[PDB]
Amino acid sequence: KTVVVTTILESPYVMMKKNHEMLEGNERYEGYCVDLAAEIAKHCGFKYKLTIVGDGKYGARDADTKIWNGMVGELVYGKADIAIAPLTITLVREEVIDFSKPFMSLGISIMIKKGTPIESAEDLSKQTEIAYGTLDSGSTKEFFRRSKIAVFDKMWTYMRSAEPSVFVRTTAEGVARVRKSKGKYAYLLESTMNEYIEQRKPCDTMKVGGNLDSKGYGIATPKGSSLGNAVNLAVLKLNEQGLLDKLKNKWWYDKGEC
Amino acid sequence: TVVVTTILESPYVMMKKNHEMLEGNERYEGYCVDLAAEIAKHCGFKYKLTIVGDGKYGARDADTKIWNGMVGELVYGKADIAIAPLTITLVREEVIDFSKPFMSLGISIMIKKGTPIESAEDLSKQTEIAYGTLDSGSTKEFFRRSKIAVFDKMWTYMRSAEPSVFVRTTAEGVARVRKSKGKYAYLLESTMNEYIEQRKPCDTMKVGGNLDSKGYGIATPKGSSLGNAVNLAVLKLNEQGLLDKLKNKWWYDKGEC
Numbered sequence A: 001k002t003v004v005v006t007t008i009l010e011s012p013y014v015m016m017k018k019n020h021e022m023l024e025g026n027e028r029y030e031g032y033c034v035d036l037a038a039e040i041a042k043h044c045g046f047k048y049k050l051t052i053v054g055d056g057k058y059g060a061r062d063a064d065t066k067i068w069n070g071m072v073g074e075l076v077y078g079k080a081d082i083a084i085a086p087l088t089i090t091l092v093r094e095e096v097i098d099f100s101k102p103f104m105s106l107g108i109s110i111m112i113k114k115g116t117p118i119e120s121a122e123d124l125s126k127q128t129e130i131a132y133g134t135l136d137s138g139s140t141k142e143f144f145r146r147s148k149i150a151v152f153d154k155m156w157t158y159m160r161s162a163e164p165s166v167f168v169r170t171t172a173e174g175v176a177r178v179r180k181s182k183g184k185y186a187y188l189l190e191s192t193m194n195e196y197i198e199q200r201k202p203c204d205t206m207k208v209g210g211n212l213d214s215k216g217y218g219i220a221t222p223k224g225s226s227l228g229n230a231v232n233l234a235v236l237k238l239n240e241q242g243l244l245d246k247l248k249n250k251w252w253y254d255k256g257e258c
Numbered sequence B: 001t002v003v004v005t006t007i008l009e010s011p012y013v014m015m016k017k018n019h020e021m022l023e024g025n026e027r028y029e030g031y032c033v034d035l036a037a038e039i040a041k042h043c044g045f046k047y048k049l050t051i052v053g054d055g056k057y058g059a060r061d062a063d064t065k066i067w068n069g070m071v072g073e074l075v076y077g078k079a080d081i082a083i084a085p086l087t088i089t090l091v092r093e094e095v096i097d098f099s100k101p102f103m104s105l106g107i108s109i110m111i112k113k114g115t116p117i118e119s120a121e122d123l124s125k126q127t128e129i130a131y132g133t134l135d136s137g138s139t140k141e142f143f144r145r146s147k148i149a150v151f152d153k154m155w156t157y158m159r160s161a162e163p164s165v166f167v168r169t170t171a172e173g174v175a176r177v178r179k180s181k182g183k184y185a186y187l188l189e190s191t192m193n194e195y196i197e198q199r200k201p202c203d204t205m206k207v208g209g210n211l212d213s214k215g216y217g218i219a220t221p222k223g224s225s226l227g228n229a230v231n232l233a234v235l236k237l238n239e240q241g242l243l244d245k246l247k248n249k250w251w252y253d254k255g256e257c
């Protein structure tokens, strides 16, 4: 059978090719997770179909309804066979889906418009003039929600209550807000994504200070799935045969415009 | 009572200065000692730290196919879990189970300060400064398998080196750097490298970026019921910030340079 892969439009992981309209199926897309999906599939020996997650989300459990949305929900409810995406490995997700060993490491980080007087999370926590926020429905938000670290607690106490909202629907909306806000909005996002944007025109953002945590992205499968074992072993193999480092270089450092 | 295999390797597991008045698990201290205690407390088991009898991480004998090291202890039923700086690798995951990683690392270069070496490419292009790795671990296997030009050239040199450039233990590698007057460089994991850089006599340095990217995981025998619980405890501990607080405790707070 053809394996249905859920993924998400998130640069440089999965992007539409400039000429996507002239192309069909898997050929419409390019990026790190596109290349990684093709390699996983070849090695494990299956055909596949890339499908972009319908609600545009990573995945969270609605606290009232109890339903999982996003990529996670496509797995949970049987709509997709695997997620190959910058999907963060978390405890609450690992309770309902399986993850491979991580294919890429990352931490939450700070994106500023260049010149903004902010060097750290501690600096953001101690002031009010520059607003800051996270993506509205993923692992970065949940991190703040849950932290007992005083600086991050203090940051959440401000973000959860700030008006108008400091949360954004997509990474791209966060980045555009940093860029348009004259130094007055800073964006909390994964280092991977921060570092990619920092090397793209108009070259007006930068990553500041250390990462706030350490984690990784994994390949996800529905709980129990037979595909999970093989996919895990393919991730390990591909790191060890150097493929993962090669794809990082291809999609980050070889694509630098700054 | 769970039998935990581990290995004496600083700052993961070390005998306390005063170990001889102490008994059982209290003889030991380090990142993996504290990690073990946290895992045990969260999954609610009693445990016994035991130091791996052959002092090795784990590799398979090419001829006999026997596994040695901490990996061997799990495979042959001698220990229930390995809590150690034990690298996740494909050949190990084929015979033992690993948690999601509790720490990231890569292979890195240790020099005696002042040595004119800045990169693996620099090591590969000269013969005056010898270099090698640990035996019987993942760093060696990385070079044995690499098809990247600079690393393949490095391996061709190391395997044929006389006298041997390989060492039995991390500590032997580090002592060979410190006494070789700049003429031996040691290839070792960045974790170990960076810890030692912060210890007296303050005469080593990590130079260059890491050559690869990997992680340490908690290991259990295949199919063990402990593997599931243990992996969930690792994730919890990371998210609660315990793993960061432990790395800060044992590297940078224990810093004397």
Ligand SMILES: CC(=O)N[C@H]1CCN(c2ccc(C3=NO[C@H](CNS(=O)(=O)C(C)C)C3)cc2F)C1
Binding pocket: A089, A100, A101, A102, A103, A104, A105, A106, A214, A215, A216, A217, A235, A236, A237, A238, A239, A240, B088, B100, B101, B102, B103, B104, B105, B213, B214, B215, B216, B234, B235, B238
């Ligand atoms: C639970 C968790 O994620 N733990 C934290 C601490 C360490 N960890 C972590 C996250 C990501 C990585 C890596 N991502 O790609 C590199 C390859 N990973 S791997 O395990 O070697 C892979 C080939 C399966 C290493 C390595 C790591 F150690 C993140």
Ligand SMILES: N[C@@H](CCC(=O)O)C(=O)O
Binding pocket: A058, A059, A086, A087, A088, A089, A135, A137, A138, A139, A140, A141, A188, A189, A190
């Ligand atoms: N990788 C994240 C999305 C981005 C973020 O939350 O900053 C997730 O899986 O939830």
Ligand SMILES: N[C@@H](CCC(=O)O)C(=O)O
Binding pocket: B057, B058, B085, B086, B087, B088, B134, B136, B137, B138, B139, B140, B187, B188, B189
């Ligand atoms: N962490 C390594 C040992 C150290 C090394 O090879 O540099 C292993 O698990 O094999």
Ligand SMILES: [Zn+2]
Binding pocket: B038, B041, B242
């Ligand atoms: Zn605890």
Ligand SMILES: [Zn+2]
Binding pocket: B061, B062, B063, B064
């Ligand atoms: Zn033999």
